[PDB]
Amino acid sequence: VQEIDLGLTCDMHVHVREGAMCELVTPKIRDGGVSIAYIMPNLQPPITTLDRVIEYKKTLQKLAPKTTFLMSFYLSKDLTPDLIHEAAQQHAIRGVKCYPAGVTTNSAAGVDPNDFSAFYPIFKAMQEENLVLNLHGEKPSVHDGDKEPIHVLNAEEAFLPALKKLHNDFPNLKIILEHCTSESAIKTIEDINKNVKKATDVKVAATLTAHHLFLTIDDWAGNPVNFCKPVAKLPNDKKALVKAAVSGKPYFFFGSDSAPHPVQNKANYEGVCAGVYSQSFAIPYIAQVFEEQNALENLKGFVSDFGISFYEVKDSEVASSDKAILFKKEQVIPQVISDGKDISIIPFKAGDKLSWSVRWEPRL
Amino acid sequence: VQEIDLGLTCDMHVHVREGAMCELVTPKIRDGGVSIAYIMPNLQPPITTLDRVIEYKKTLQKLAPKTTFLMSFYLSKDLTPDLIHEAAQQHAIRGVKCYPAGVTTNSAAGVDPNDFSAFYPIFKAMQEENLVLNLHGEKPSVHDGDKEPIHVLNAEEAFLPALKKLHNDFPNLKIILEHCTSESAIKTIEDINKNVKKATDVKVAATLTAHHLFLTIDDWAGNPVNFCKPVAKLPNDKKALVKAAVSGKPYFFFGSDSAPHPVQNKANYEGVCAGVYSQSFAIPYIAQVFEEQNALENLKGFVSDFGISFYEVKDSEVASSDKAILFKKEQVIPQVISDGKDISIIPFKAGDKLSWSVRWEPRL
Ligand SMILES: O=c1[nH]cc(F)c(=O)[nH]1
Ligand SMILES: O=c1[nH]cc(F)c(=O)[nH]1
Ligand SMILES: [Zn+2]
Ligand SMILES: [Zn+2]
Ligand SMILES: [Zn+2]
Ligand SMILES: [Zn+2]
């Protein structure tokens, strides 16, 4: 069979929850082919204190000894510059993730993106400490009308001005637009990096999930098992995301936004939970897209090089030097991923076949 | 004011199913404030024979004796022109409802709206007997190359050319574009009727449901109770649909498409059944919209005059001359509508309050 050496794979956008769900999914980071994971903080309650973020990490390290864990704070009014400096100096966090209020899971305690200025003390601290500002780039929905209405299909586009202002007011702050879903977002990211030479000139980057390289609105209309935020959009939007993933440009890299929910939280008649579970086959999902685009040469950059470069991951922190090797063995996605107790998850593309699998090999 | 006499209200898009669902739902046409109801044919198997429509009608008359029932055929691969003639002259049907294949509930036995020509002999038979052809105007979805993609958001707009051709080849045929959802469809219906002098000049008309005057995509993204076909679209579309409802023009009138399903067919993680159940409060729902637009003068035309005029309903056919009286008593929509046995339904806008109720008064 043929093999592809991918090195230290990166998934810079992971949800791993708490409790038994966390014991179920955290080992699946490695099985999915991912060596380094950026952990998102939207627990209940949100992670806003130093002791709890340092209480979450070793719990994950205990569940997965070989996986490198970059942690984050949840952007909240309970954060202070001294908290940001203390957390950075103790190597507890690697960035702060912002959730607009009400737009996705556990975002009710979030910020209004028609402000952001109230968090300028926080951004100055993060800029001084070289932390990353992660943005769930969606404006909350407004349907009445003075300004043009915001809804799930243009909310991301309506957010692009807020990103542009943040980057102008903080030119040295590393900012990621998480899980880009619209062509407008791709063009804004490309234009911001118009005079970019090498990868380290990138200060504003964007992550792309696995599922948005497959899904369009027709896949989640009537299928809550494919419903997520931001919502998958039009075929032209999916084309732009795929061309950006295989582009080879250093300001697009992989962030799965694997968001597990028990099956009974997706089979609601109202209030369905947003989120697609992709951890168990994260790298093979991406390999399939890259294979169909005849762009497999560019896979290592999108899932490994560019995320390590942007996050400045050193071997000093990496928990294991094992290399993820992709090999072309066909496999079938199970129908459920269960902990054999109370938790069952429907995986992304359940029942479908993938051309690749993943194994680990040490270095030297 | 306090009371509005709406006369003989008509809901020209009704689904009542069979069995225990039917016994539950059919009496709620009258409870909703509707005297005349056009019954749809998408049962299992579809209604395509004279014996099955008549027995269906007899069941509905037994369950709701004071409700006037207009029946329909399912546009099917085994319908015949002489069937249309025999059914029309026996006064068993008033029209044939077309379902594009796969686009909605029980549409698998449907048509491909790209080769309507196979049904022109049937359309020519319906034209001769002055029957109504009801159109679920949506093209089936296309993601597969060359041709521009079709999805739930433009499937209605992609269907408008077919409606245009069908009316051009059959100018005397009464055709209804059922449940409009897009501004594109509204503008096309306006253009088809540019200089129509009054209601009997209308031959291509459009029905608006109750739920499409409230809903947008943000309401059904995470709420399968509000998921239906065609999907509710953008605020700009709802602007047009609402405006057309209160328009006072005779080519827009009420058709609820109340489509009941048991709750367990809505709380799926995939394959959610399309359909919003609104029968039980059909007229009060619409009264809310006409009230909020300060257009209650036009409620009688939208909910009674134009439907009766277009379908040319005569007093000889009506099962009861009782008048629908709308009166401003506040009521609360239940959380569930149950038959006390196996069937529970979440009504549209469950738990919300309506400013109006409806009662019946006889003709003396
Ligand atoms: O962006 C997100 N979508 C869905 C989730 F469950 C989550 O936790 N975060
Ligand atoms: O147009 C329709 N949508 C949903 C249904 F269940 C139905 O029967 N008809
Ligand atoms: Zn997010
Ligand atoms: Zn996320
Ligand atoms: Zn329909
Ligand atoms: Zn219908």
mmCIF file of N, CA, C and O in Angstrom, chain B residues 250-320:
data_model
loop_
_atom_site.group_PDB
_atom_site.id
_atom_site.type_symbol
_atom_site.label_atom_id
_atom_site.label_comp_id
_atom_site.label_asym_id
_atom_site.label_seq_id
_atom_site.Cartn_x
_atom_site.Cartn_y
_atom_site.Cartn_z
ATOM 1 N N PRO B 250 -56.146 39.376 -5.907
ATOM 2 C CA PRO B 250 -56.900 38.107 -5.953
ATOM 3 C C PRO B 250 -56.096 36.880 -6.366
ATOM 4 O O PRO B 250 -56.662 35.779 -6.417
ATOM 5 N N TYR B 251 -54.807 37.012 -6.672
ATOM 6 C CA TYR B 251 -54.007 35.849 -7.032
ATOM 7 C C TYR B 251 -53.176 35.327 -5.856
ATOM 8 O O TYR B 251 -52.351 34.421 -6.039
ATOM 9 N N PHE B 252 -53.399 35.861 -4.654
ATOM 10 C CA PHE B 252 -52.831 35.333 -3.422
ATOM 11 C C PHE B 252 -53.983 34.980 -2.506
ATOM 12 O O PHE B 252 -54.864 35.814 -2.285
ATOM 13 N N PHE B 253 -54.032 33.736 -2.037
ATOM 14 C CA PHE B 253 -55.011 33.398 -1.015
ATOM 15 C C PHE B 253 -54.485 32.270 -0.128
ATOM 16 O O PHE B 253 -53.448 31.660 -0.391
ATOM 17 N N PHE B 254 -55.261 31.942 0.890
ATOM 18 C CA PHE B 254 -54.782 31.098 1.967
ATOM 19 C C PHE B 254 -54.824 29.618 1.603
ATOM 20 O O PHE B 254 -55.831 29.119 1.092
ATOM 21 N N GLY B 255 -53.719 28.926 1.886
ATOM 22 C CA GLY B 255 -53.596 27.485 1.838
ATOM 23 C C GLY B 255 -52.587 27.048 2.888
ATOM 24 O O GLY B 255 -51.389 27.261 2.714
ATOM 25 N N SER B 256 -53.042 26.437 3.981
ATOM 26 C CA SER B 256 -52.170 26.292 5.140
ATOM 27 C C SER B 256 -51.017 25.315 4.914
ATOM 28 O O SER B 256 -49.951 25.494 5.499
ATOM 29 N N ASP B 257 -51.204 24.287 4.091
ATOM 30 C CA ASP B 257 -50.309 23.126 4.084
ATOM 31 C C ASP B 257 -50.035 22.653 5.507
ATOM 32 O O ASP B 257 -48.902 22.353 5.896
ATOM 33 N N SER B 258 -51.080 22.614 6.316
ATOM 34 C CA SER B 258 -50.912 21.962 7.601
ATOM 35 C C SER B 258 -50.605 20.494 7.313
ATOM 36 O O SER B 258 -51.417 19.807 6.686
ATOM 37 N N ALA B 259 -49.408 20.035 7.694
ATOM 38 C CA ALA B 259 -48.913 18.686 7.400
ATOM 39 C C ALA B 259 -48.543 17.978 8.703
ATOM 40 O O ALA B 259 -47.397 18.072 9.175
ATOM 41 N N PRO B 260 -49.481 17.243 9.307
ATOM 42 C CA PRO B 260 -49.212 16.621 10.612
ATOM 43 C C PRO B 260 -48.314 15.397 10.496
ATOM 44 O O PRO B 260 -48.362 14.675 9.503
ATOM 45 N N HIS B 261 -47.425 15.231 11.488
ATOM 46 C CA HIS B 261 -46.569 14.045 11.699
ATOM 47 C C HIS B 261 -46.492 13.800 13.198
ATOM 48 O O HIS B 261 -46.449 14.762 13.978
ATOM 49 N N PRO B 262 -46.433 12.550 13.642
ATOM 50 C CA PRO B 262 -46.212 12.310 15.074
ATOM 51 C C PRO B 262 -44.863 12.878 15.494
ATOM 52 O O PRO B 262 -43.950 13.022 14.680
ATOM 53 N N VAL B 263 -44.767 13.256 16.773
ATOM 54 C CA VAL B 263 -43.560 13.897 17.300
ATOM 55 C C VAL B 263 -42.311 13.049 17.049
ATOM 56 O O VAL B 263 -41.214 13.590 16.849
ATOM 57 N N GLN B 264 -42.442 11.720 17.051
ATOM 58 C CA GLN B 264 -41.259 10.882 16.890
ATOM 59 C C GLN B 264 -40.688 10.955 15.477
ATOM 60 O O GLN B 264 -39.499 10.681 15.286
ATOM 61 N N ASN B 265 -41.471 11.401 14.507
ATOM 62 C CA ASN B 265 -40.973 11.634 13.161
ATOM 63 C C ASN B 265 -40.340 13.000 13.000
ATOM 64 O O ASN B 265 -39.955 13.352 11.880
ATOM 65 N N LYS B 266 -40.379 13.827 14.045
ATOM 66 C CA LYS B 266 -39.647 15.078 14.043
ATOM 67 C C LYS B 266 -38.363 15.015 14.862
ATOM 68 O O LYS B 266 -37.398 15.712 14.532
ATOM 69 N N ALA B 267 -38.283 14.126 15.839
ATOM 70 C CA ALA B 267 -37.111 14.034 16.700
ATOM 71 C C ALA B 267 -36.216 12.890 16.225
ATOM 72 O O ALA B 267 -35.928 11.907 16.913
ATOM 73 N N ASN B 268 -35.834 13.029 14.975
ATOM 74 C CA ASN B 268 -34.852 12.182 14.345
ATOM 75 C C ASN B 268 -33.526 12.942 14.319
ATOM 76 O O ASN B 268 -33.505 14.176 14.305
ATOM 77 N N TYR B 269 -32.406 12.209 14.351
ATOM 78 C CA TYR B 269 -31.127 12.860 14.066
ATOM 79 C C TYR B 269 -30.842 12.930 12.571
ATOM 80 O O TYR B 269 -29.857 13.560 12.178
ATOM 81 N N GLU B 270 -31.648 12.273 11.744
ATOM 82 C CA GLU B 270 -31.525 12.363 10.292
ATOM 83 C C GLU B 270 -32.848 11.926 9.672
ATOM 84 O O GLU B 270 -33.618 11.188 10.294
ATOM 85 N N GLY B 271 -33.122 12.407 8.467
ATOM 86 C CA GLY B 271 -34.405 12.082 7.870
ATOM 87 C C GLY B 271 -35.614 12.637 8.608
ATOM 88 O O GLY B 271 -36.638 11.952 8.718
ATOM 89 N N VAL B 272 -35.525 13.864 9.127
ATOM 90 C CA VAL B 272 -36.688 14.482 9.754
ATOM 91 C C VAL B 272 -37.789 14.663 8.714
ATOM 92 O O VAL B 272 -37.534 15.030 7.557
ATOM 93 N N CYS B 273 -39.024 14.370 9.113
ATOM 94 C CA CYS B 273 -40.160 14.538 8.214
ATOM 95 C C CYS B 273 -40.480 16.016 8.021
ATOM 96 O O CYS B 273 -40.596 16.770 8.990
ATOM 97 N N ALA B 274 -40.625 16.433 6.767
ATOM 98 C CA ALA B 274 -41.037 17.799 6.478
ATOM 99 C C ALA B 274 -42.512 18.003 6.826
ATOM 100 O O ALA B 274 -43.339 17.115 6.617
ATOM 101 N N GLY B 275 -42.844 19.188 7.347
ATOM 102 C CA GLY B 275 -44.232 19.519 7.624
ATOM 103 C C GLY B 275 -44.526 20.258 8.915
ATOM 104 O O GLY B 275 -44.105 19.861 10.012
ATOM 105 N N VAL B 276 -45.315 21.316 8.807
ATOM 106 C CA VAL B 276 -45.712 22.092 9.969
ATOM 107 C C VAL B 276 -47.206 21.910 10.146
ATOM 108 O O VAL B 276 -47.976 22.097 9.196
ATOM 109 N N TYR B 277 -47.621 21.561 11.360
ATOM 110 C CA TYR B 277 -49.038 21.372 11.641
ATOM 111 C C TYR B 277 -49.624 22.661 12.195
ATOM 112 O O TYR B 277 -49.275 23.080 13.313
ATOM 113 N N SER B 278 -50.563 23.245 11.443
ATOM 114 C CA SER B 278 -51.178 24.513 11.802
ATOM 115 C C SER B 278 -52.702 24.487 11.741
ATOM 116 O O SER B 278 -53.322 25.533 11.973
ATOM 117 N N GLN B 279 -53.271 23.345 11.372
ATOM 118 C CA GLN B 279 -54.742 23.269 11.214
ATOM 119 C C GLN B 279 -55.462 23.812 12.453
ATOM 120 O O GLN B 279 -56.180 24.783 12.333
ATOM 121 N N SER B 280 -55.151 23.343 13.616
ATOM 122 C CA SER B 280 -55.941 23.597 14.801
ATOM 123 C C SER B 280 -56.165 25.081 15.075
ATOM 124 O O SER B 280 -57.079 25.418 15.827
ATOM 125 N N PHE B 281 -55.356 25.970 14.508
ATOM 126 C CA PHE B 281 -55.468 27.401 14.760
ATOM 127 C C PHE B 281 -55.268 28.183 13.476
ATOM 128 O O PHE B 281 -54.687 29.275 13.476
ATOM 129 N N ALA B 282 -55.747 27.623 12.364
ATOM 130 C CA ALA B 282 -55.409 28.143 11.047
ATOM 131 C C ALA B 282 -55.755 29.625 10.923
ATOM 132 O O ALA B 282 -54.892 30.458 10.621
ATOM 133 N N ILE B 283 -57.013 29.975 11.168
ATOM 134 C CA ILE B 283 -57.475 31.353 10.990
ATOM 135 C C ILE B 283 -56.842 32.291 12.016
ATOM 136 O O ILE B 283 -56.340 33.356 11.628
ATOM 137 N N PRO B 284 -56.819 31.954 13.318
ATOM 138 C CA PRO B 284 -56.143 32.849 14.280
ATOM 139 C C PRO B 284 -54.680 33.123 13.960
ATOM 140 O O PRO B 284 -54.237 34.259 14.194
ATOM 141 N N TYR B 285 -53.910 32.137 13.446
ATOM 142 C CA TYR B 285 -52.542 32.424 12.992
ATOM 143 C C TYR B 285 -52.542 33.587 12.009
ATOM 144 O O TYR B 285 -51.847 34.589 12.207
ATOM 145 N N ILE B 286 -53.370 33.492 10.970
ATOM 146 C CA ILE B 286 -53.384 34.506 9.923
ATOM 147 C C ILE B 286 -53.860 35.839 10.479
ATOM 148 O O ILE B 286 -53.344 36.906 10.109
ATOM 149 N N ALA B 287 -54.815 35.797 11.415
ATOM 150 C CA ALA B 287 -55.312 37.026 12.023
ATOM 151 C C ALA B 287 -54.186 37.810 12.684
ATOM 152 O O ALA B 287 -54.172 39.047 12.624
ATOM 153 N N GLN B 288 -53.222 37.111 13.285
ATOM 154 C CA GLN B 288 -52.081 37.788 13.889
ATOM 155 C C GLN B 288 -51.318 38.597 12.849
ATOM 156 O O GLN B 288 -51.032 39.780 13.055
ATOM 157 N N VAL B 289 -51.032 37.988 11.691
ATOM 158 C CA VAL B 289 -50.264 38.690 10.668
ATOM 159 C C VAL B 289 -51.032 39.899 10.167
ATOM 160 O O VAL B 289 -50.493 41.010 10.065
ATOM 161 N N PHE B 290 -52.305 39.703 9.846
ATOM 162 C CA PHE B 290 -53.071 40.809 9.300
ATOM 163 C C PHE B 290 -53.226 41.914 10.327
ATOM 164 O O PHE B 290 -53.321 43.095 9.963
ATOM 165 N N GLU B 291 -53.252 41.549 11.613
ATOM 166 C CA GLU B 291 -53.309 42.557 12.665
ATOM 167 C C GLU B 291 -52.009 43.348 12.739
ATOM 168 O O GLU B 291 -52.019 44.580 12.670
ATOM 169 N N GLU B 292 -50.873 42.650 12.781
ATOM 170 C CA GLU B 292 -49.590 43.323 12.897
ATOM 171 C C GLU B 292 -49.276 44.202 11.704
ATOM 172 O O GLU B 292 -48.390 45.056 11.798
ATOM 173 N N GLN B 293 -49.965 44.007 10.581
ATOM 174 C CA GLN B 293 -49.749 44.823 9.399
ATOM 175 C C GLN B 293 -50.820 45.878 9.256
ATOM 176 O O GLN B 293 -50.821 46.617 8.266
ATOM 177 N N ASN B 294 -51.709 45.977 10.239
ATOM 178 C CA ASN B 294 -52.854 46.875 10.186
ATOM 179 C C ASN B 294 -53.570 46.729 8.851
ATOM 180 O O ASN B 294 -53.841 47.704 8.151
ATOM 181 N N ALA B 295 -53.887 45.478 8.507
ATOM 182 C CA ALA B 295 -54.523 45.199 7.228
ATOM 183 C C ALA B 295 -55.708 44.250 7.379
ATOM 184 O O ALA B 295 -56.060 43.549 6.435
ATOM 185 N N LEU B 296 -56.370 44.249 8.541
ATOM 186 C CA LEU B 296 -57.464 43.317 8.780
ATOM 187 C C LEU B 296 -58.647 43.504 7.819
ATOM 188 O O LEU B 296 -59.525 42.634 7.757
ATOM 189 N N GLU B 297 -58.736 44.611 7.087
ATOM 190 C CA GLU B 297 -59.840 44.716 6.128
ATOM 191 C C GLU B 297 -59.716 43.611 5.082
ATOM 192 O O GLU B 297 -60.731 43.180 4.507
ATOM 193 N N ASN B 298 -58.465 43.217 4.766
ATOM 194 C CA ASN B 298 -58.151 42.309 3.677
ATOM 195 C C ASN B 298 -58.112 40.859 4.110
ATOM 196 O O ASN B 298 -57.888 39.973 3.276
ATOM 197 N N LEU B 299 -58.411 40.599 5.374
ATOM 198 C CA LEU B 299 -58.392 39.233 5.855
ATOM 199 C C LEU B 299 -59.491 38.416 5.176
ATOM 200 O O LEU B 299 -59.270 37.260 4.803
ATOM 201 N N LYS B 300 -60.676 39.006 4.979
ATOM 202 C CA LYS B 300 -61.756 38.233 4.374
ATOM 203 C C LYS B 300 -61.411 37.823 2.953
ATOM 204 O O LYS B 300 -61.693 36.691 2.543
ATOM 205 N N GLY B 301 -60.778 38.715 2.192
ATOM 206 C CA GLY B 301 -60.432 38.363 0.830
ATOM 207 C C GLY B 301 -59.363 37.291 0.777
ATOM 208 O O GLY B 301 -59.480 36.322 0.023
ATOM 209 N N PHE B 302 -58.337 37.421 1.621
ATOM 210 C CA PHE B 302 -57.232 36.477 1.580
ATOM 211 C C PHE B 302 -57.662 35.103 2.066
ATOM 212 O O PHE B 302 -57.143 34.079 1.602
ATOM 213 N N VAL B 303 -58.596 35.062 3.006
ATOM 214 C CA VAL B 303 -58.949 33.819 3.666
ATOM 215 C C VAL B 303 -60.271 33.237 3.183
ATOM 216 O O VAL B 303 -60.631 32.125 3.605
ATOM 217 N N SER B 304 -61.032 33.963 2.358
ATOM 218 C CA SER B 304 -62.359 33.489 1.958
ATOM 219 C C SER B 304 -62.698 33.813 0.510
ATOM 220 O O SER B 304 -63.005 32.911 -0.267
ATOM 221 N N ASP B 305 -62.708 35.103 0.162
ATOM 222 C CA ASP B 305 -63.202 35.525 -1.144
ATOM 223 C C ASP B 305 -62.398 34.897 -2.275
ATOM 224 O O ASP B 305 -62.957 34.273 -3.185
ATOM 225 N N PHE B 306 -61.081 35.063 -2.245
ATOM 226 C CA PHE B 306 -60.280 34.673 -3.398
ATOM 227 C C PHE B 306 -60.210 33.150 -3.554
ATOM 228 O O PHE B 306 -60.257 32.630 -4.680
ATOM 229 N N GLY B 307 -60.171 32.416 -2.444
ATOM 230 C CA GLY B 307 -60.164 30.972 -2.559
ATOM 231 C C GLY B 307 -61.463 30.462 -3.143
ATOM 232 O O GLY B 307 -61.462 29.628 -4.054
ATOM 233 N N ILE B 308 -62.587 30.986 -2.657
ATOM 234 C CA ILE B 308 -63.888 30.599 -3.190
ATOM 235 C C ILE B 308 -64.037 31.042 -4.636
ATOM 236 O O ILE B 308 -64.552 30.293 -5.477
ATOM 237 N N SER B 309 -63.619 32.267 -4.949
ATOM 238 C CA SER B 309 -63.714 32.713 -6.331
ATOM 239 C C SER B 309 -62.883 31.820 -7.255
ATOM 240 O O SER B 309 -63.415 31.262 -8.223
ATOM 241 N N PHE B 310 -61.599 31.588 -6.917
ATOM 242 C CA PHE B 310 -60.713 30.873 -7.843
ATOM 243 C C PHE B 310 -61.150 29.430 -8.032
ATOM 244 O O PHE B 310 -61.160 28.921 -9.156
ATOM 245 N N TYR B 311 -61.486 28.748 -6.950
ATOM 246 C CA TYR B 311 -62.016 27.402 -7.078
ATOM 247 C C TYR B 311 -63.483 27.391 -7.497
ATOM 248 O O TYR B 311 -64.051 26.304 -7.657
ATOM 249 N N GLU B 312 -64.122 28.559 -7.619
ATOM 250 C CA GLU B 312 -65.510 28.676 -8.075
ATOM 251 C C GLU B 312 -66.434 27.781 -7.245
ATOM 252 O O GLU B 312 -67.151 26.917 -7.759
ATOM 253 N N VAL B 313 -66.374 27.985 -5.931
ATOM 254 C CA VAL B 313 -67.176 27.212 -4.986
ATOM 255 C C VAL B 313 -68.591 27.763 -4.984
ATOM 256 O O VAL B 313 -68.800 28.975 -4.832
ATOM 257 N N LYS B 314 -69.564 26.877 -5.184
ATOM 258 C CA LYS B 314 -70.980 27.217 -5.200
ATOM 259 C C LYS B 314 -71.643 26.824 -3.885
ATOM 260 O O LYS B 314 -71.163 25.941 -3.167
ATOM 261 N N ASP B 315 -72.762 27.492 -3.578
ATOM 262 C CA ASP B 315 -73.463 27.225 -2.325
ATOM 263 C C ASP B 315 -74.050 25.816 -2.270
ATOM 264 O O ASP B 315 -74.208 25.255 -1.178
ATOM 265 N N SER B 316 -74.335 25.207 -3.424
ATOM 266 C CA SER B 316 -74.867 23.846 -3.445
ATOM 267 C C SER B 316 -73.911 22.824 -2.831
ATOM 268 O O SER B 316 -74.368 21.808 -2.289
ATOM 269 N N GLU B 317 -72.589 23.055 -2.917
ATOM 270 C CA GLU B 317 -71.624 22.057 -2.457
ATOM 271 C C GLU B 317 -71.297 22.158 -0.979
ATOM 272 O O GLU B 317 -70.840 21.175 -0.388
ATOM 273 N N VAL B 318 -71.524 23.312 -0.368
ATOM 274 C CA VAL B 318 -71.078 23.539 0.997
ATOM 275 C C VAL B 318 -71.887 22.684 1.976
ATOM 276 O O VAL B 318 -73.116 22.599 1.878
ATOM 277 N N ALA B 319 -71.184 21.981 2.879
ATOM 278 C CA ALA B 319 -71.805 21.078 3.849
ATOM 279 C C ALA B 319 -72.466 21.793 5.017
ATOM 280 O O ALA B 319 -73.186 21.151 5.797
ATOM 281 N N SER B 320 -72.182 23.073 5.208
ATOM 282 C CA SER B 320 -72.830 23.836 6.258
ATOM 283 C C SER B 320 -72.670 25.307 5.938
ATOM 284 O O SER B 320 -71.574 25.743 5.600
#
